Amino acid sequence: PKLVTWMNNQRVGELTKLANGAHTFKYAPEWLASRYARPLSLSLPLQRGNITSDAVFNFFDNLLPDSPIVRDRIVKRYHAKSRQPFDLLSEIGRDSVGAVTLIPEDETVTHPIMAWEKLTEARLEEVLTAYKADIPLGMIREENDFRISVAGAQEKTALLRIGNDWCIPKGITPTTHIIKLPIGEIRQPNATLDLSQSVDNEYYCLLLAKELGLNVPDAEIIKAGNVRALAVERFDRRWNAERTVLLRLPQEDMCQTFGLPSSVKYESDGGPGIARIMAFLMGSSEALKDRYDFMKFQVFQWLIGATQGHAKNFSVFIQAGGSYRLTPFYDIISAFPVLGGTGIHISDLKLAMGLNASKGKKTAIDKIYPRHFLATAKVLRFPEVQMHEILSDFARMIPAALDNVKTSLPTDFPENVVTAVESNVLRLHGRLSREY
């Protein structure tokens, strides 16, 4: 029972579901014997023979949705053999996050390689409201070519845009976007989250992120009838130098990077933090810069209060030769517009990975001061003279950032989201001015 694994169009090896349920992968000699070859994941480097590591399982399990519901659907959708990472992927394992492609050992490929199917304005709304039909990742039933897969827990979908048209890829056509819908859970301790308007909030956050010289993905708000969904330009997808072929970008996150399961994704649950990930960024290609933009992303998160910035929300492109480097900062949301007399106080918002405090780690966003950010870099051998610069710029830039954004907002954008965010971002920013 195999599952041929390709990377773009070259063969890497084959995943196989054992007779007891275990998962084993083995790199094809063709892939192994090539000066320009890279591993499936930094949790399983190139090697001859079979591989059994709990890693060869976790890797693929992270390649599936983080929501029971979604997986509850993925099954009934295509009648999966089971709920294990394999049998599920056998179904929608085609276009997934990164450049990995899983094809059933026996149903071999014919048909034009890269084929899709344009979508009518009135049909797109379907793909966007597929949950109403009990469908996973928005994959219309009529067809059957739809076999995408995406991580996360939010009701989303991924499509292929050609020129000025929304197309549902076919066979193994790489999707170019990730249209996420305003439904699902978020985090903090013991408590999940329902906030403002997913799209607006996220959008806003990305706008500030970008306006704040922060590297994030290209995304715009869209509307298919009465469906306000957000579509982000996948940063693991790229066309040939002249738009001839649409290639993928081998990528993986920080949970697979360490061979860790999906469960242990939250530091509080035994996951990695600013210390385990940084100590790992010292081996990154552009390590000097990757270590910098990271730390800076912490302040930003602390400033816009992003309580769901766990280990599964950070990745690294797998560069040829097994080398790696940090990717853009995807998935950005503020918990500020959820505060107030809604029984949730700012003293309750905690961060995913804590900072070097006086005693262990400090998370409550309502308690983190400059000293905590420095003590963090101090401990992690991150030049202090470089952190002060970060806390600095923020003190001088944020005030204007929250403004330049207000002027570049949609018409129908919740005037109140901005209110609950720019107020808190400003209260926190204050702790900065008072030092820098």
Ligand X SMILES: Nc1ncnc2c1ncn2[C@@H]1O[C@H](COP(=O)(O)OP(=O)(O)CP(=O)(O)O)[C@@H](O)[C@H]1O
**Site of interaction with ligand X (CB under 6 A):** 66, 97, 150-154, 156, 178, 180, 217, 232, 234-236, 253, 308, 312-313, 315, 330-331
Nearer to ligand X, 207 or 432 (CB): 207
* Phi, psi values for residue 19, rounded to 5°: -70, -5
Judging by beta carbons within 10 Å of its beta carbon (0-12, 13-18, 19+), is residue 133 exposed, middle or buried?
exposed
Name the residue number minimizing CB distance to ligand X.
152
Sign of the CA dihedral with 256 first, then 258, 261, and 266 last: negative
Residue 361 gets the label, from left (phi > 0), alpha (psi -120 to 50) or beta, of beta
DSSP conformation letters of 133-189: GT-SSS--SS---------SSSSEE--EE-SSSEE--EETPPP-EEEE-S-S---SS
Please, what is the minimum distance in Å from the beta carbon of residue 302 to ligand X?
A: 17
Residue 35 gets the label, from left (phi > 0), alpha (psi -120 to 50) or beta, of alpha
Please, what is the minimum distance in Å from the beta carbon of residue 254 to ligand X?
A: 9
Q: How far is CA 298 from CA 292, 369, 373, in A?
A: 10, 12, 8
Taking the alpha carbons at both ends of the chain, their separation in whole angstroms is 61
Nearer to ligand X, 198 or 424 (CB): 198
Nearer to ligand X, 150 or 377 (CB): 150
Please, what is the minimum distance in Å from the beta carbon of residue 255 to ligand X?
A: 9
Nearer to ligand X, 153 or 398 (CB): 153
C-alpha 148/C-alpha 146 separation (Å) is: 6
Nearer to ligand X, 305 or 387 (CB): 305
Nearer to ligand X, 56 or 230 (CB): 230
Please, what is the minimum distance in Å from the beta carbon of residue 71 to ligand X?
A: 13
Please, what is the minimum distance in Å from the beta carbon of residue 156 to ligand X?
A: 6
Q: How far is CA 337 from the centre of its chain?
A: 22
Contact by Cβ (8 Å): 331, 152: yes
Length of the chain: 436
Please, what is the minimum distance in Å from the beta carbon of residue 164 to ligand X?
A: 20
Please, what is the minimum distance in Å from the beta carbon of residue 135 to ligand X?
A: 16
Nearer to ligand X, 166 or 330 (CB): 330
Using DSSP, state whether 54 is helix, strand or coil.
Answer: helix
Cβ partners under 8 Å of residue 232, min gap 6: 177, 178, 180, 206, 217, 218, 219, 330
Please, what is the minimum distance in Å from the beta carbon of residue 434 to ligand X?
A: 32
Among 375, 362, 348, 368, which Cα is nearest to 431's? 368
Please, what is the minimum distance in Å from the beta carbon of residue 241 to ligand X?
A: 20
Please, what is the minimum distance in Å from the beta carbon of residue 65 to ligand X?
A: 8
Please, what is the minimum distance in Å from the beta carbon of residue 253 to ligand X?
A: 5
Nearer to ligand X, 3 or 230 (CB): 230
Determine the residue type at 241.
A
CB atoms within 10 A of CB 79: 7
Determine the residue type at 309.
G
C-alpha 149/C-alpha 63 separation (Å) is: 7
Nearer to ligand X, 66 or 95 (CB): 66
Nearer to ligand X, 153 or 375 (CB): 153
Using DSSP, state whether 310 is helix, strand or coil.
Answer: coil
Nearer to ligand X, 126 or 155 (CB): 155
